[PDB]
C-alpha cells in the first residue's frame, strides 16, 4: 500500500537532485486492455473474466479505422478499463504472478518518457484466483502511468517498490 | 560402453605426449576411431581420417557433447536430395 509510498518516496528524494516534494512521481493511471480480430460469443467470457479479476466492469469499443481485409467494419472488439484510485494502490500489490517461467520482467523500455511498464500475459491466474476452468485463456495487455517525464525515474521508483528489472 | 573404462590406442596418446608439453601444435593427422576425447587432448588440433580424407577439427573447450571418431559423418551430403 501507500505505506510503502513514504519509503520509496524518500529513497527517490535522496536519489535525484530534488529540492521539494512536488517534484516527485506518484501512482497514476493503470488501465487494462483486451481485444480480438473478432468475437461473437467470445467477448462475454472475456469481460466476465475481467468482471471477476476486477470487481467493476469495463468498456466495449467499436471500430473506426476502415478494415476490410481482416473482416468488415464496426465489428466490436477490445475492453479498456480505468483502474485509477487508491483501489489501484491495492491492485499494485497483486503481483504474485509467477506462473510457469516468469523470469523476464521486461526491463525493455516502454514509452520513452516516464511510462516504463510491462504488457503482461495469462488469465490462468493474476497472482490470485487459479480458476482451473477456462473456455479460452488470453494475454492481458496492461499499461501503466506515472506523473513524470523520464522513464528511469519510474524504473527506480517501482523497482524500489518491489518490481524486478530482469 | 567400456569396461571401466576410457581408453586410447596407445600410439595417438603416445604422440600427443610429445606434442603437449612444449609449445603446442595446431596440427595432428590421424585415423582415430578407437580413441576419444578427454582433457589431455585439449589445446591441440586433430584431423581424423574420415575414410577418404582427414579434415581439421580444433579441440575446443567443452568438446564433450562430441568425440574424436567423427565430426562430419561420412554419409556426406546427405545421402539424400532433401
Amino acid at each position: 500500500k501507500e505505506k510503502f509510498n513514504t519509503e520509496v518516496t524518500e529513497n527517490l528524494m535522496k536519489k535525484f537532485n530534488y529540492s521539494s516534494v512536488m517534484e516527485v512521481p506518484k501512482i497514476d493511471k493503470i488501465v487494462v486492455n483486451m481485444g480480438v480480430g473478432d468475437a461473437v460469443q467470445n467477448s462475454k467470457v472475456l469481460d466476465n473474466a475481467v468482471e471477476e479479476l476486477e470487481l467493476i466492469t469495463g468498456q466495449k469499443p467499436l471500430v473506426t479505422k476502415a478494415k476490410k481485409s481482416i473482416a468488415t467494419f464496426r465489428l466490436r472488439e477490445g475492453m479498456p478499463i480505468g483502474a485509477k484510485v487508491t483501489l489501484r494502490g491495492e491492485r499494485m500489490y497483486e503481483f504474485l504472478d509467477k506462473l510457469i517461467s516468469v523470469s523476464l520482467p521486461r526491463v525493455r523500455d516502454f514509452q520513452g518518457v516516464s511510462k516504463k511498464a510491462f504488457d503482461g500475459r495469462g488469465n490462468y491466474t493474476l497472482g490470485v484466483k487459479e480458476q482451473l476452468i477456462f473456455p479460452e485463456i488470453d494475454y492481458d495487455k496492461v499499461s501503466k502511468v506515472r506523473g513524470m517525464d523520464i522513464v528511469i525515474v519510474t524504473t527506480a521508483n517501482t523497482d524500489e517498490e518491489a518490481r524486478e528489472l530482469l | 560402453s567400456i569396461k571401466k573404462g576410457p581408453f586410447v590406442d596407445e600410439h595417438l596418446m603416445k604422440k600427443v605426449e610429445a606434442q603437449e608439453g612444449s609449445e603446442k601444435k595446431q596440427v595432428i593427422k590421424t585415423w582415430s576411431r578407437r580413441s576419444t576425447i578427454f582433457p589431455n587432448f585439449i589445446g591441440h588440433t586433430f584431423a581424423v581420417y574420415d575414410g577418404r580424407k582427414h579434415v581439421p577439427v580444433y579441440v575446443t573447450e567443452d568438446m564433450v557433447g562430441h568425440k574424436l571418431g567423427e565430426f562430419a559423418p561420412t554419409r556426406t551430403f546427405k545421402g539424400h536430395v532433401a
Binding site: 510457469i100 482451473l132 | 568438446m63 557433447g65 567423427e70 559423418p73
Partner: protein
C-alpha cells in the same frame, strides 16, 4: 498448483494424480507417497490439509519442473554448439545409435 508445481487434477487418485506433473512417472510417485505414508485408495483425491504439507514439500526432492524442459534445452544446446556431429542427426530422426531411415518419414520429420 494445486499442491505442487502446476496443473493437478481434482477428485482423482494419487496413483496418477502425482504423475501429470512434468517429470513424475509411476514408480517415483509411489516412492514419494511412500515417504509421507499416503496412498489412494482408490479413484479419487481425498486430500485434506493433514498430508498436504508433506505432499507439498516432499515433491521438492527433484527438478520436476520446466527447468527439466530447460535441462533438455540447455543440453541439446550443448550438443549443437560444438561441431556437432549428433545435432545434425538430431534432426533426421536418428538417435545417437542410428535408426536406418527408409520408413522413418516420420514422427521426428514431415
Amino acid at each position: 498448483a494445486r499442491i505442487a508445481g502446476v496443473d493437478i487434477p481434482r477428485e482423482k487418485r494419487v496413483v496418477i494424480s502425482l504423475t501429470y506433473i512434468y517429470g513424475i512417472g509411476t514408480s517415483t510417485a509411489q516412492k514419494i507417497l511412500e515417504e509421507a505414508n499416503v496412498s489412494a485408495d482408490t479413484r479419487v483425491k481425498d486430500l485434506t490439509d493433514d498430508e498436504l504439507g508433506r505432499i507439498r514439500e516432499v515433491v521438492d526432492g527433484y527438478k520436476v519442473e520446466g527447468d527439466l524442459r530447460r535441462e533438455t534445452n540447455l543440453n541439446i544446446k550443448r550438443l549443437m554448439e560444438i561441431s556437432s556431429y549428433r545435432g545434425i542427426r538430431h534432426r533426421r530422426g536418428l538417435p545417437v545409435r542410428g535408426q536406418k531411415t527408409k520408413n522413418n518419414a516420420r514422427t521426428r520429420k514431415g
